[PDB]
Curated annotation (Swiss-Prot):
This is Alpha-cobratoxin. The keyword Ribosomal protein does not apply. Negative results: the monomeric form has no effect on alpha-3/beta-2 (CHRNA3/CHRNB2) nAChR. It does not show any blockade of the nicotine-evoked release of dopamine and does not affect ACh release. Does not inhibit the homopentameric alpha-1 glycine receptor (GLRA1), when tested at 40 uM. Pfam families: Toxin_cobra-type. Its main location: secreted. Expressed by the venom gland. Disulfide bonds join C4-C21, C15-C42, C27-C31, C46-C57, C58-C63. The record marks R37 as: Binds to both neuronal alpha-7/CHRNA7 and Torpedo AChRs, may be important for inhibition of GABA(A) receptors. GO terms for cellular component: extracellular region. It is found in: Secreted. Changing A29G: 5-fold decrease in affinity for neuronal alpha-7/CHRNA7 AChR. Monomer: binds with high affinity to muscular (alpha-1-beta-1-gamma-delta/CHRNA1-CHRNB1-CHRNG-CHRND) nAChR (tested on Torpedo californica, Kd=0.2-4.5 nM) and neuronal alpha-7/CHRNA7 nicotinic acetylcholine receptors (Kd=13-105 nM). Also inhibits GABA(A) channels. Homodimer: binds with high affinity (but lower than the monomeric form) to muscular (IC(50)=9.7 nM) and with low affinity to neuronal alpha-7/CHRNA7 nAChRs (IC(50)=1370 nM). However, it acquires (compared to the monomeric form) the capacity to block alpha-3/beta-2 (CHRNA3/CHRNB2) nAChRs. Changing R37A: 16-fold decrease in affinity for Torpedo AChRs.
Length: 68
């Protein structure tokens, strides 16, 4: 059970089976004009990410706000 921010809307949700919040960022084909993609979510464990995807995982409520 954890509360986290969730994309795409960027609002907080209860995740009854979650234990971490995460922020994933990466470049898609439009990175050069729109900036990085940002995924905010909750998971039972910190996700395993592939090359090109940055991730930050934390375990307190709403610890993954949209980057400023």
């Amino acid at each position: 059970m954890i509360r986290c921010f969730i994309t795409p809307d960027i609002t907080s949700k209860d995740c009854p089976n979650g234990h971490v919040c995460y922020t994933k960022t990466w470049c898609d084909a439009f990175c050069s004009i729109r900036g990085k993609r940002v995924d905010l979510g909750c998971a039972a464990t910190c996700p395993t990410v592939k090359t090109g995807v940055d991730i930050q995982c934390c375990s307190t409520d709403n610890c993954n706000p949209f980057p400023t």
